[PDB]
C-alpha cells in the first residue's frame, strides 16, 4: 500500500537530452534520431523579445551558429528549420538511445512527468498536471527551457510538453513538441496572464478512491447524491463540472472499491461544505487534484 506523487522512470528521456547554444544563449534540446527539438527563442537576444522577428533571426544563422552538445560532446548541425515555436536542428549523428516515441497533445486535467534539465543535464523528475487554464505548476529555474514532459504508454514515450516560460504568478507555460502553445500564450514578452484556475474534480475523486484503497476511509459514509446536485456544490467551490464521461473513467476505481461514483461525490460534497475538520487524507490536509484516475490505477495496480 501507500500513495506517493509518482513519476514515470526517466531513463528513456534522459538519453535524449542535449544542450543547444546560439551565441550567448544556452537551453535544453530533445535529441530524437537525427533531429534536435528546442524552443525557438534560443535564437533571440534582449533586443528581440517584445517583437522577435524569428524568421529574420533564423535566416541570419548558419548551421555553424548552433552548438549542440550531448553530454558536453559536440554534435554537428547540418540543417535548421522552424515549426511554430520549436526549432528543429538536423544533426549528423542519430541518437542511438532514442526510445520508441510519439508526439501527443494532452488535455487539461491530465498529468505528465517532467524531466527538469539544465545545460543538457537532467536534474530531477516530478509529476505535473496540465491545469484547466493551460498552465502547469512546475519547478523550473533559469536555464530550464527545453525540458520536456512525457508519459509512458506501454513501451512508448509520449512527449507532450516542452518548457518555454514562467508567468509572474509563478506558474509555467510551454508548447507541445509540434511547437504549439498550450493556452493563450506566445513566445514574445508581452504581458501575459492565465485565466482563473479551477480544481480538477475528477482527479480529486480519483485521489479519494486512492485513499479508500489504502484504508483511509473516515470521510466515507453510506451517502449518495445526483450528478446535478453535486455540480451545484462543485461550482460554489471553483471545481470543474463533473460530466458523465468523468463518471465513466472513474469506473475502474469504483469497481475495485465497490463505492459508486456518486457515493464518492457525496463524500466530496460533504468535505467541501463542512471541511476536513483537522483530518488528513493520504497525508494531505487539502484535497489533491493532480492525480488522474489512470494515475491511481497505475500506482494501485503496479503496471510496468
* Catalytic-residue membership of 145: yes
- Judge residue 219's burial from the number of C-beta atoms within 10 Å of its C-beta, 0-12 exposed, 13-18 middle, 19 or more buried: middle
* Minimum gap (Å) between residue 287 Cβ and a copy of itself: 10
Which H or E run contains 160? strand 156-166
* Catalytic-residue membership of 80: no
Q: Give the Cα separation of 88 and 99 in Å (integer).
A: 18
**Other C-beta atoms within 10 Å of 209: how many?**
24
Backbone angles phi, psi at 126, to 5 degrees: -145, 170
Q: Which is nearer to a copy of itself, 176 or 216 (CB)?
A: 216
Residue 10, interface with a copy of itself (CB under 8 A)?
A: yes
Whether 177 and 30 have beta carbons less than 8 Å apart is answered as yes
Which H or E run contains 37? strand 35-39
Partners of 75 in the beta sheet?
68
Residue 73, interface with a copy of itself (CB under 8 A)?
A: no
Residue 304, interface with a copy of itself (CB under 8 A)?
A: yes
* Minimum gap (Å) between residue 5 Cβ and a copy of itself: 5
Backbone angles phi, psi at 271, to 5 degrees: -70, -40
Q: Give the Cα separation of 48 and 65 in Å (integer).
A: 18
- Judge residue 86's burial from the number of C-beta atoms within 10 Å of its C-beta, 0-12 exposed, 13-18 middle, 19 or more buried: buried
* Minimum gap (Å) between residue 44 Cβ and ligand YVG: 8
* Minimum gap (Å) between residue 69 Cβ and ligand YVG: 15
Residue 143, interface with a copy of itself (CB under 8 A)?
A: yes
Residue 171, interface with a copy of itself (CB under 8 A)?
A: yes
Q: What is the rounded radius of gyration, in angstroms, for the C-alpha atoms of the chain?
A: 22
Residues 110-129 that bind a copy of itself (CB under 8 A): 115-119, 121-128
Residues 14-53 that bind a copy of itself (CB under 8 A): 14-15
> Which range of residues in 71-79, 92-100, 134-142, 267-275 is near ligand YVG by CB under 6 A?
134-142
> Which range of residues in 23-31, 200-208, 220-228, 294-302 is near ligand YVG by CB under 6 A?
23-31
Q: Which is nearer to a copy of itself, 54 or 101 (CB)?
A: 101
Please pick, from the candidates 31, 66, 101, 140, the single residue that binds ligand YVG as defined by CB under 6 A: 140
Which member of 145, 160, 265, 300 is catalytic?
145
Whether 195 and 167 have beta carbons less than 8 Å apart is answered as no
Q: Which residues bind ligand YVG (CB under 6 A)?
A: 25-27, 41, 49, 140-145, 164-168, 172, 187-189, 192
Which sequence positions are flagged as catalytic?
41, 145
Amino acid at each position: 500500500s501507500g500513495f506517493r506523487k509518482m513519476a514515470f522512470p526517466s531513463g528513456k528521456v534522459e538519453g535524449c537530452m542535449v544542450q543547444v547554444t546560439c551565441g550567448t544563449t544556452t537551453l535544453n534540446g530533445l535529441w530524437l534520431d537525427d533531429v534536435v527539438y528546442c524552443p525557438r527563442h534560443v535564437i533571440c537576444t534582449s533586443e528581440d523579445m517584445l517583437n522577435p522577428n524569428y524568421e529574420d533571426l533564423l535566416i541570419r544563422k548558419s548551421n555553424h551558429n548552433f552548438l549542440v552538445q550531448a553530454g558536453n560532446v559536440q554534435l554537428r548541425v547540418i540543417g535548421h528549420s522552424m515549426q511554430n515555436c520549436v526549432l528543429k536542428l538536423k544533426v549528423d549523428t542519430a541518437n542511438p538511445k532514442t526510445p520508441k516515441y510519439k508526439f501527443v497533445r494532452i488535455q487539461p486535467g491530465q498529468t505528465f512527468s517532467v524531466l527538469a534539465c539544465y545545460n543538457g543535464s537532467p536534474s530531477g523528475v516530478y509529476q505535473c498536471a496540465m491545469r484547466p487554464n493551460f498552465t502547469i505548476k512546475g519547478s523550473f529555474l533559469n536555464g530550464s527551457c527545453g525540458s520536456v514532459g512525457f508519459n509512458i504508454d506501454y513501451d512508448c514515450v509520449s512527449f507532450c510538453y516542452m518548457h518555454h516560460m514562467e508567468l509572474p504568478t509563478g506558474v509555467h507555460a510551454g508548447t507541445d513538441l509540434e511547437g504549439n502553445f498550450y493556452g493563450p500564450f506566445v513566445d514574445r514578452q508581452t504581458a501575459q496572464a492565465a485565466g482563473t484556475d479551477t480544481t480538477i474534480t475528477v482527479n480529486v475523486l480519483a485521489w479519494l478512491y486512492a485513499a479508500v484503497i489504502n484504508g483511509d476511509r473516515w470521510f466515507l459514509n453510506r451517502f449518495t447524491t445526483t450528478l446535478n446536485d453535486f455540480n451545484l456544490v462543485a461550482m460554489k467551490y471553483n471545481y470543474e463540472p463533473l460530466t458523465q464521461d468523468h463518471v465513466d473513467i472513474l469506473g475502474p476505481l469504483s469497481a475495485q472499491t465497490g463505492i459508486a461514483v456518486l457515493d464518492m461525490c457525496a463524500s466530496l460534497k460533504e468535505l467541501l461544505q463542512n471541511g476536513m475538520n483537522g483530518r488528513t487524507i493520504l497525508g494531505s490536509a487539502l484535497l489533491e487534484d493532480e492525480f488522474t484516475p489512470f494515475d491511481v490505477v497505475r500506482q494501485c495496480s503496479g503496471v510496468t
